[PDB]
Amino acid sequence: NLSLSQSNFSADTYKSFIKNLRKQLTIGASYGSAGIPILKHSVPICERFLLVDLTNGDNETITLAINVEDAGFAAYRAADRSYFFQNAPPIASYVIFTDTNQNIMNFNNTFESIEIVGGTTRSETPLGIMHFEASIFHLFVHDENYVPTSFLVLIQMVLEAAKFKFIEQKVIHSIMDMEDFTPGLAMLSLEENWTQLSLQLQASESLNGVFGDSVSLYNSMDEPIGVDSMYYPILTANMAFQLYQCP
Amino acid sequence: NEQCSPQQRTTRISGRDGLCVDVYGALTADGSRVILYPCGQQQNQQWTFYPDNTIRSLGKCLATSALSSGSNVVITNCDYLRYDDGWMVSSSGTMMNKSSHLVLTANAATSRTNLTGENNVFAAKQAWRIGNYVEPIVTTIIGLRHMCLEATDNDTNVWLESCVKNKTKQYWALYSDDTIRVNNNRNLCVSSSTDSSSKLIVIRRCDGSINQRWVFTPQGTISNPGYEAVMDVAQNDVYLKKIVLSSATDKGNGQQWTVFY
Ligand SMILES: *[C@@H]1O[C@H](CO)[C@@H](O[C@@H]2O[C@H](CO)[C@@H](O)[C@H](O)[C@H]2NC(C)=O)[C@H](O)[C@H]1NC(C)=O
Ligand SMILES: OC[C@H]1O[C@@H](O[C@H]2[C@H](O)[C@@H](O)[C@H](O)O[C@@H]2CO)[C@H](O)[C@@H](O)[C@H]1O
Ligand SMILES: *[C@@H]1O[C@H](CO)[C@@H](O)[C@H](O)[C@H]1NC(C)=O
Description:
The complex is a heterodimer of chains A (247) and B (261).
Chain A: E1 2-5, H1 11-25, E2 49-55, E3 61-67, E4 72-78, E5 81-84, E6 101-104, H2 111-118, H3 129-141, H4 147-163, H5 165-177, H6 185-203, E7 210-218, E8 224-229, H7 233-236
Parallel strand pairs in A: 1-2, 5-6
Antiparallel strand pairs in A: 2-3, 3-4, 4-5, 7-8
Helix pairs in contact in A: 1-4, 1-5, 2-4, 3-4, 4-5
Chain B: E1 9-11, E2 13-14, E3 20-23, E4 32-37, E5 47-49, E6 55-57, E7 60-64, E8 71-76, E9 87-89, E10 95-97, E11 103-106, E12 115-118, E13 129-130, E14 137-143, E15 147-152, E16 157-161, E17 171-174, E18 180-182, E19 188-191, E20 202-205, E21 215-216, E22 222-224, E23 229-233, E24 243-246, E25 258-260
Antiparallel strand pairs in B: 1-5, 2-13, 3-4, 4-8, 5-6, 6-7, 7-8, 8-12, 9-10, 11-12, 14-15, 14-17, 14-25, 15-16, 17-18, 19-20, 21-22, 22-23, 23-24
The structure holds a molecule of 2 linked components (NAG-NAG), a molecule of 2 linked components (BGC-GAL) and 2-acetamido-2-deoxy-beta-D-glucopyranose (NAG).
Keywords (chain A): Disulfide bond, Glycoprotein, Hydrolase, Plant defense, Protein synthesis inhibitor, Signal, Toxin
Protein name (chain A): Ribosome-inactivating protein
Family (chain A): In the N-terminal section; belongs to the ribosome-inactivating protein family. Type 2 RIP subfamily.
């Protein structure tokens, strides 16, 4: 399984992990005019998950199950206990972490369900190596006080970074600066719109690369930028892969 | 689902020096020419795109006026394109007549400049951003060894330095004509070599040329489509202080680049 130990967590290593994660998610990906891979769809439940291993400062590891169809966590294993989201595919139970004591968490893998249950937003949740490591611990022992916050951190640093080079580069800056950051509007707007941008960018085939509706992607100065076409470098040299939407 | 097949969309078109595609004085009549003009909210800079492969302002379709190079691009009756295949727009923003292969070109950079159908040489003056946001995108450009590009030697040269947040000369303004310009002095552009003996990439006054057109590709490269080559770090060594134009190769990571805005 693809791994990222905090004991070996440089800018170079992080980038290599994220790069490989993209590669594995984009196996059998379809391609449009934009040249940005589209994730697989109608994948049989037996082949639908990609396993990823995250190790903390104690050499203790969690194995996360990433749905290849949408690059979200369906579940994770820790020693011999596994934990599933409610909205995880119903038959996932019978396919992954089969030889463990399975639990169902009382919420969905969406940021909205996590922020509701956790009682805190992404805007007030710092990110960084120190927090990356802390989240693996808290998921390994499964202290339910911290479980929601730990997913905010890890979804953003692994999956949303895989989705967006901007987010990948936010984490890289943090690694080399040795300094934490809370996500800004730029980051959050990319997380918010990944689903919508996937639709508009695939519908854009119809109108020579022009969107059906504009998408506001904020910059680092908190100025919105309307993206209503495939001809924006902040979309094209940023979004690594996209959700299947249109045939 | 009928959200995958959107029936139309109205938006602006920006290009050379960030000026917009504009029908001269909002004139209705067939053959009324189209020009560069400073961008605004007026009805004659609004371009509505359709599955008909048409691009419409003032209820009338954008079109080339001749099979030869050098003639104006105009607006005319959409009934006259009854069995025409219309416009095609490449990934890089080259707007092309499907039949003649002529491409939307701005032979100068000033206001009221006539736009014409010319042969595609992949120049900066033949590159266009379809979209309402016409502004330059101010950004840093990160490359090999997590370093930022920086304008150096009085905005004449360019190479990699370590990313300092405040630093002025590490910021680049990305224009609608595919040009990468110095943020503090937007008359200047990132340019490939004018000298045949060098492959060195340098900073020069903008001139609508092939040397200054740059595409940020989804596969992570910075491409110059005219010269069929990409930005590369010299010998994959950032301390040589030389960025060069090279054929695309996965040998090394000097041809991999990120936009951070
Ligand atoms: C693209 O250009 C082609 C040729 O330049 C155009 O097709 C011709 O249109 C003229 C009117 O100017 C007709 O009388 C000719 O019969 C057509 N000739 C050919 C070669 O088909 C077409 O109008 C242009 N289309 C657009 C949308 O620009
Ligand atoms: O000069 C190009 C500019 O024209 C404006 O329209 C003017 C036009 O120039 C003038 O001849 C007419 O008498 O009055 C019009 C309205 O002010 C357009 O507003 C502009 O978009 C350009 O096309
Ligand atoms: C979880 O997802 C389901 C649909 O899969 C939805 O009906 C439900 O409202 C979501 N949230 C919670 C807290 O169950």
